[PDB]
Each structure stands twice: as C-alpha cells, then as structure tokens.
C-alpha cells in the first residue's frame, strides 16, 4: 500500500 | 498556490461543484487534489483524491455522491456532491503537494438551505446589573435565540441615535434543539450608561426586525 | 492503521515553549509517516511536517524550520511535536495524523486535536454577574477569566431545558468573557430559585450565583 502523507 | 470561494449555498438534493482553483502557471493536470470535511470539534476528515478517471481514490466510508473531477479549464480540482444532505453542511478543504510542501486552501464553508422551518430570533435585551455598576463597569447584553436561517443583523442604539464603539456580537451557533443563537455586547462606563434615557437592541432577521430596550433604573 | 490519541489542552506565554504527544492507540505506531497539521480558529489546515516511526528522519515544513522538532519515543509508542518560541498566532488546534491508500480507497487516522494557546494574559478565575428578568430569558454573565474553557450549569444540573451557552468574547485585556440564558415560564419566577454553576477548572474556581428580580 501507499503512504497517505509523502 | 490554492485557491477556493470561502462560502458556498444550495438547496437540499441539488448538485454542487466545489471549485480548488491552482495558482496561474501550476499546471493542474500534474496534481492529485485532495479533499477533506470538517465538522466544528472534529478534525479534518478525508473525502477522497483525483487525479483522473483513472487514478482516484475514495476515502473510507465517504458516501459515493461525493465524487471528484477536474477542470482544465479554470486550472481548478472539483468536488462534486450530488443529493445535498443537511449533514453536508461543514466546511470543505482541499491539498496538493507542490514545492515539497502539504499546501492547503483557505477552505469553503457549505450551508444548506431551508433545512428546517424559518425561526423568527427570540430577543431578551438586559441592563447592567446593580453588581456590575458597583464594579465600576456597566455591560448590556443582547441575547438572540430560537433563530433559523443562522444570520442576524444586529444594530444598537442610544436614546434613538446609532451606536459604533463598544460592540462584540458572537458569531451564530446551533443550540440544542438545532436552531440558532448569538449574543451581542455593548460595552459602558456607567456614566454612559446613565447619560442616556435608553439604549435598544435591533435584531433584524430576514427582513424583520425586533427592537427591546433598557433604562437605568 | 492505528487510532491516535494526543494529549490534552496547552496555554503558554510568549516566547516559551510547548510539546504536543500523540500516542498510538494500542501502544505501538505503524510504520506509515505521522504528519502534523495546525488549525488556526476559523482558518484552514496547515502542515508542519512529518516524522517516519521506525526511522525517526524528519521532514519541516519551511515556515516552521529552526522552530519545530519532532521525535518518537524509543519504543514506537508515543510521537512528539514540539514548537519553540511561540507566538500568539501559533494559537491553534495541533493534530497528528497517518494513513495508507489502496489503489481504490485511502485511510487517514486523525488525532482528535490538541489545542495550543498562547497569550500574554494569565490564569484568572471569571466574575459573574446576574441578569435578571408567558416565558421570561435569565442568565448570568461570566466575566474576565483565562483561560478557556468556563462551563455552566444551572440549578446544579437539575435545569437543562431552554438553556444555551453562548460562545465567549476576547477582551482587550486577553481575557474572555460569555453569557448562559436559560428561558423558563414567567409564573415560575416568583417562587422557583435559579442559580447559574459556572466551573472554571483552569484555575480551581467555581462561582455560584443566584439570579433575581
């Protein structure tokens, strides 16, 4: 999954 | 770099395009828009991103009537809500990343209109208290209550001329029971206060306008 | 992936500092980066920077360079946000937030929020004043206290219908000010007795007034 806040 | 229209109402059911317009030259097809809802006391929540058709991503539980799009255009992300909903009504923020930089814009407040019957304000208007004068300072307080639409004008008076310094008003809330209040202060020496036969307090309130009045005793 | 908890209410001077925690619900951070984000009253989110959990390698927003530090605590449990020589417009609502997205959907934990007052003004205890009054509007005037917040009840709890308190006022002085109403039936003013219960817990203080005609 992916980070939200980078 | 962001730009939105600070205030933005509808009708319940309608379809309303909130509009994140990017600074000229940053090119808005080369940013994923954020969108965030905030409810007063709560933080920010995540609505949803776009980038395009292809890439866009829902937040979790966010009903599907929210909806994410773009305008080339006007260089702006959009955010669509269609069935307008009472619980919509909060205000609305939007986010990119640019310059290695969380930017956010100055947000939209949304209300809806005619959610709930029209509520002429209840308006009690009191002096000084006797307390408060022996303490050297003299408050009238106007306290405005049972209103809907959450808008009020209020004027104040001395004898019959308008008053300009020494007035705070609160911006309106919602009461318990879902409708609105507001309070307004009117700030005096209590020698002022006792060099006039009255001071009123005008509430007008979708054309109406309701005027009560003190004295010193 | 992991509820937030921040820690509570923060009133300083100018020039000193504060320290905000934000402490993993479960007691062990993710490793997706924790952003901080502040909110000015009745202005939009502004972010401050973020912090990674496992690495503890930083990344400050310009505007908040050479004034911000954020950490973690050794075990991964708590992190930290910490901002130095404040200003009273660093009056704010500091949140920590982390999330992850699917391709389809994305997550984001909030922090339910710590509020960050700075003023010149000190810790004072509010003066409260009568206003006395088919239904009739009474109440009491809670005057001159710092900080917030100041709560009233009436009649010990025993009286909440037609009762609203308003929002409170900024003083010249610093200070705040508010007004309770509560609305009853005009018969009732000749025999019942109402006393407004104003509670203002940043100073220990409790006031007591009974309203008349």
Request: glycine share 8%.
């Amino acid at each position: 999954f992916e980070d939200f806040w980078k | 770099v962001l730009t939105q229209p600070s205030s933005l109402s509808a009708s319940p059911g309608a379809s309303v395009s909130l509009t994140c317009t990017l600074r000229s030259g940053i090119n808005v097809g080369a940013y994923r828009i954020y969108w965030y809802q905030q409810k007063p006391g709560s933080p920010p929540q995540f609505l949803l991103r776009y980038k395009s058709d292809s890439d866009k991503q829902q937040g979790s539980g966010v009903p599907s009537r929210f909806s994410g799009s773009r305008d080339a255009s006007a260089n702006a992300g959009i955010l669509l809500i269609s069935g307008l909903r009472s619980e919509d009504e909060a205000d609305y923020y939007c986010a990119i990343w640019h310059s290695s930089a969380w930017v956010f814009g100055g947000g939209t407040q949304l209300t809806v209109l005619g959610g709930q019957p029209k509520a002429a304000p209840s308006v009690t208007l009191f002096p000084p208290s006797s307390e408060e004068l022996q303490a050297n300072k003299a408050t009238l307080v106007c306290l405005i209550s049972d209103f809907y639409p959450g808008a009020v004008t209020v004027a104040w008076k001395a004898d019959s001329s308008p008053v300009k310094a020494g007035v705070e008003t609160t911006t309106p809330s919602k009461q318990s029971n879902n409708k609105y209040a507001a309070s307004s202060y009117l700030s005096l020496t209590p020698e002022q206060w006792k060099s006039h036969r009255s001071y009123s307090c005008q509430v007008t309130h979708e054309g109406s306008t309701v005027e009560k009045t003190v004295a010193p005793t | 992936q992991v509820q937030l908890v921040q820690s509570g209410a923060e009133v300083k001077k100018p020039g000193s500092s504060v320290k905000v925690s934000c402490k993993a619900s479960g007691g062990t951070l993710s490793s997706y980066a924790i952003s901080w984000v502040r909110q000015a009253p009745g202005q939009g989110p502004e972010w401050m920077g973020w912090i990674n959990p496992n690495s503890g390698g930083t990344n400050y927003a310009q505007k908040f360079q050479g004034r911000v530090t954020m950490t973690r605590d050794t075990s991964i449990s708590t992190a930290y946000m910490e901002l130095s020589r404040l200003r009273p417009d660093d009056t704010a609502v500091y949140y920590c937030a982390s999330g992850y997205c699917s391709r389809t959907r994305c997550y984001d934990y909030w922090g339910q929020g710590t509020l960050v007052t700075v003023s010149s003004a000190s810790t004072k205890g509010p003066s409260v004043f009568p206003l006395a009054p088919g239904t009739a509007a009474l109440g009491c005037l809670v005057k001159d206290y710092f900080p917030e917040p100041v709560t009233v009840s009436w009649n010990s709890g025993a009286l909440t219908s037609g009762v609203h308190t308003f929002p409170a006022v900024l003083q010249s002085s610093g200070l705040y000010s508010l007004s309770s109403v509560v609305t009853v039936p005009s018969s009732s003013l000749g025999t019942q007795t109402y006393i407004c219960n104003v509670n203002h817990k940043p100073s220990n203080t409790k006031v007591d007034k009974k309203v008349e005609p």
